[PDB]
């Protein structure tokens, strides 16, 4: 019915709306702007952004396996 639900501690994506077909830059690679290869996508532990292993700067020969992975847009050296 009417729009309500006052209590709620969540949020959706407006850049795409919340769908697979709806291409996004945040939910997926922001560099090239691709929304494929969800297995080779690295998520940031700060802004929560998906980035390909071959779209970094510098790039990545493959997927890392360290403690965590932080996008190049967050890592301030």
Cβ within 8 Å of residue 75, ≥6 positions away? none
Nearer to Zn ion among residue 2 and residue 62 (C-beta): 62
Q: What length does the chain have?
A: 77
Query: Any contact of residue 30 with Zn ion (CB under 5 A)?
Result: no
Stretch that binds Zn ion, among 5-13, 35-43, 60-68 (CB under 5 A): 5-13
Among 16, 40, 43, 60, binds Zn ion (CB under 5 A): 16
Among 29, 42, 50, 53, binds Zn ion (CB under 5 A): 29
Helices H, strands E: what count in the chain?
A: 0, 2
């Amino acid at each position: 019915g009417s729009s309500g639900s006052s209590g709620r501690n969540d949020t959706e994506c407006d850049l795409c709306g919340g769908d697979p077909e709806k291409k996004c830059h945040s939910c997926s690679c922001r560099v090239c702007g691709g929304k494929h290869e969800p297995n080779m996508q690295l998520l940031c532990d700060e802004c929560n952004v998906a980035y390909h292993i071959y779209c970094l700067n510098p790039p990545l020969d493959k997927v890392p396996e360290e403690e965590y992975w932080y996008c190049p847009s967050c890592k301030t050296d």
